[PDB]
A = this chain, B = another copy of it.
């Protein structure tokens, strides 16, 4: 440590303390509006409905009878459709099916007879039980073959009337549908003759379709004849007859599917966009502040009904006796393709402002389909960031406000501490060792000059020999400003300060014990006499500072993770059409010669 010599400060330089600053204002709280919400997503599930398929499994086989064996020289298999007359007057009316298959095939009016015998009404019976299969009924199980006749190619016909209940599936624009057997029906499931249903798509002749009003279906297993009538549609395809109940299109299909029902969906406005955050599901959405026209959604007649039902149910369940509805439900299109049906609410404690919020809330040729993203993590991350960033910022603001107040509060103490020891207060505030004097309401300063530690010596005795009973308050010292400069009489001061005047006089008292700072340690005195030097660590130390142990957040590495890779999902299927077709089509190239030609 170096010593310092400071001359008497004068008015050549003055300094003052900074006045209290204006601390930051508390940020305004965000305006959150409570309300119920329902989130909708793009509908990807095909329209499903029940249908009945009627057809006759006609088959004729040619058999060759050898001397001691029989061989099948050819087996022809074909599916024949059941006409409307039969499906209405025999199967449905009596549960019987004609044994003759009459239909058009390859532009020819072909006819077949079961066992080549005369026509006869055959009873329909349930088919053999099978696990995970819909109900089905048939009329014949044993295939008919010609009788044995040595050396002849005889023929035998078999007609097996079959009726089955299959699940039909359809997708947008719902212009066609498939059946459980994989057969395609190029006709809209909603095609008909009533209420503009004739405008639907149809790829068959007008005579191939028939609609029956007031149709009473008759179950085949149980012979009941239904309880209420229905509008039955019947189509005769080239290979089968399919029948299904007709229903209106608009209230039967919907392009949007209800995804979540949020009980508490807080909505805030900032940055020109609403923020719908749900604490229950931990998700945050963003819109454009303009209600999405619900009429623009193609086939979106289910959105309003489902939204209103869910809103009423949730309101009656929770907000029945605590809040009130403010305006009709609002619809907004959130980022990512999510349609949100919002319902603002207001607490009963401040219902007087209902008239002011109603009108403000009410202020918020073609159709299209909303495309919803397959990942919601973009919204969950937004909520997580907001859930942490918002509270952290609040605490940071409070710390800054409190810190500023503390500094202004301490200005009072410094105003008084400076008068007690201007040299110490001026040195720490100015940033360098300087002597100061109180020139009224402002303080003057003068820079000190350092002195080497080896260029100072302390007089052993502080006793003033001049007057007995008179002693000095600090030890006397001799110091040379230079390494070999003339020594300069002086007195020791506080904090290694060297004053050039031995004016600090005090009456000598018995039992004098003192310690004075000197360089990097202290100088011990006893009875006004120098005893010895001692290091700084020789005295017990007490920490006057408040310990704070802030620890930074450790870095983290997020490794990739997936529950099921895309390869695992693909492998989950029992059968693969691509692999099955590739292997099956290689049969000819593997087990046969595809180029050799034999002729004679």
Q: List 21 A-B contacts (CB under 8 A).
A: A16-B542, A17-B541, A17-B544, A107-B143, A130-B589, A131-B201, A160-B592, A178-B578, A203-B589, A281-B559, A282-B557, A282-B558, A336-B560, A372-B563, A374-B564, A374-B565, A375-B560, A384-B384, A385-B558, A400-B550, A440-B515
The interface-forming segment of A40-48, A309-317, A320-328, A351-359 is A40-48
Q: How far is the CA of A516 from the CA of B439 in the complex (A)?
A: 9
User: What B residues does A419 contact at CB under 8 A?
Assistant: 420
- Known A71-B112, A108-B63, A515-B441: A57·B17 in contact at CB below 8 Å: no
Specify the chain B residue showing the minimal Cβ separation from A336. Answer: B560
- How would residues 151 to 195 of chain A score, 1 for a CB under 8 Å from any chain B CB and 0 otherwise? 000010100101000000111000110101111101000000000
Give Cα distance in the complex from A414 to B543, angstroms: 11
Q: Which of B16, B157, B391 contacts A540 (CB 8 A)?
A: B16
Q: Which of A134-142, A244-252, A287-295, A477-485 lies at the interface?
A: A134-142
A581 interfacial by beta-carbon distance below 8 Å? yes
Q: Which residues of B contact A15 (CB under 8 A)?
A: 539-542
Of the candidates B13, B380, B600, which one forms a contact with A381 in the assembled complex, judged by CB atoms under 8 Å apart?
A: B380
Whether A147 contacts B17 by the Cβ 8 Å rule is no
**10 cross-chain pairs, A with B, having the tightest CB-CB distances, nearest first:** A440-B514, A407-B545, A106-B143, A182-B580, A69-B111, A442-B515, A400-B550, A11-B513, A44-B572, A74-B76
Q: Are B387 and A388 in contact (CB under 8 A)?
A: no
A566 within 8 A of B: yes
Q: Does A50 have its Cβ within 8 Å of any Cβ on chain B?
A: no
A572 to chain B, nearest CB (A): 4
The answer to whether B381 and A574 have CB atoms under 8 Å apart is no
CB distance from A20 to the nearest CB of B (A): 9
Write out the residue numbers on chain B whose beta carbons fall within 8 Å of the beta carbon of A373.
560, 562-563, 565
- Interchain CA distance A388-B424 in the complex, whole Å: 42
Instruction: Find out whether the CB atom of B142 lies under 8 angstroms from the CB atom of A593.
Output: yes
Residues of B near A372 (CB, < 8 A) are 563
Q: Judge whether A138 and B591 touch: CB under 8 Å.
A: yes
Q: For A541, give its contact among B16, B111, B389, B574 (CB under 8 Å).
A: B16
Say yes or no: is A93 at the interface (Cβ < 8 Å to chain B). Answer: no
Chain B neighbourhood of A112, CB < 8 A? 71
Residues in B neighbouring A106, C-beta threshold 8 A: 59, 61, 72, 75, 143, 145
From A213-221, A227-235, A425-433, A450-458, the one touching the partner chain is: A425-433
Q: Which among B402, B404, B407, B568 is the interface contact of A45 at CB below 8 angstroms?
A: B568
Given the interface contacts A70-B110, A391-B551, does A596 sit within 8 Å of B142 by beta carbon?
yes
Complex contact B182–A575 (CB within 8 A): yes
Cα separation A406 to B421 with both chains bound (whole Å): 19
- Which chain B residues border A548 with CB–CB below 8 Å? 398-400, 402-404
Q: List B contacts of A85 (CB < 8 A).
A: none
- Distance in angstroms between the alpha carbons of A405 and B425 in the assembled complex: 15
Partner of A128, one of B282, B377, B385, B590: B590
Taking a contact as CB atoms closer than 8 A, the residue among B44, B238, B562 that contacts A374 in the complex is B562
Q: A142-B598, A378-B559, A565-B374 are in contact. Are A111 and B400 (CB under 8 A)?
A: no
Chain B hits for A551, CB < 8 A: 391, 394-395
Residues of B within 8 A of A374 (CB): 562-566
* Contact, CB under 8 Å: B558 / A379: yes
In the bound complex, what is the Cα–Cα distance between A575 and B130 (angstroms)? 21
Query: Which chain A residues (234-270) contact chain B, with CB distance < 8 Å?
Result: 238, 259
> Chain B residues with Cβ under 8 A from A162's Cβ?
591
- A597 with B108, Cβ < 8 A, contacts A46-B572, A381-B558, A396-B395 known: yes
Cβ of A581 and Cβ of B181 under 8 Å apart? no
Give A566's nearest chain B residue, CB to CB.
Answer: B374
Report the interface size for chain A: residues with CB under 8 A from the other chain: 205
* Given A399-B550, A430-B542, 12 more pairs with CB closer than 8 A: A14-B515, A21-B545, A46-B574, A57-B591, A71-B110, A104-B597, A107-B596, A143-B592, A148-B600, A182-B575, A184-B581, A410-B545
Chain B residues contacting A559 (CB-CB under 8 Å) are 280-282, 335, 378
* Interface residue? A411 (CB, 8 A): yes
Whether A281 and B561, one on each chain, are in contact in the complex, defined by CB atoms closer than 8 angstroms, is yes
Which residues of the partner chain B approach A513 to less than 8 Å between Cβ atoms?
A: 10-11, 439, 444
Chain B residues with CB under 8 A of A408: 545
B78 and A72 form a contact (CB under 8 A)? yes
Does A223 count as interface, using CB distance less than 8 angstroms? no
- A585 in the interface, Cβ–Cβ < 8 Å? yes
B421 and A415: CB pair below 8 A? yes
Whole-angstrom CA separation of A392 from B143 in the bound complex: 81
Given A375-B563, A565-B374, CB of A131 within 8 Å of CB of B175: yes
Within the complex, what minimum Cβ distance (angstroms) separates A517 from chain B? 5
Q: Mark A345-384, 1 if CB is under 8 A from B, else 0.
A: 0000000000000000000000000001111111111101
Closest to A63 in B: B108
**Are A107 and B402 neighbours in the complex by a CB distance under 8 Å?**
no
CA A396 to CA B392, docked complex, whole Å: 10
In the bound complex, residues from chain B placing their C-beta under 8 Å from that of A171 are 574
Chain B: CB-nearest residue to A136: B590
* B564, A44: Cβ atoms closer than 8 Å: yes
Instruction: Tell me the minimal C-beta distance from A313 to chain B in angstroms.
Output: 20
Q: Which of B131, B396, B562, B580 contacts A181 (CB 8 A)?
A: B580
Query: A197 in the interface, Cβ–Cβ < 8 Å?
Result: no
Q: Give bound CA distance, A56 to B385, whole Å.
A: 65
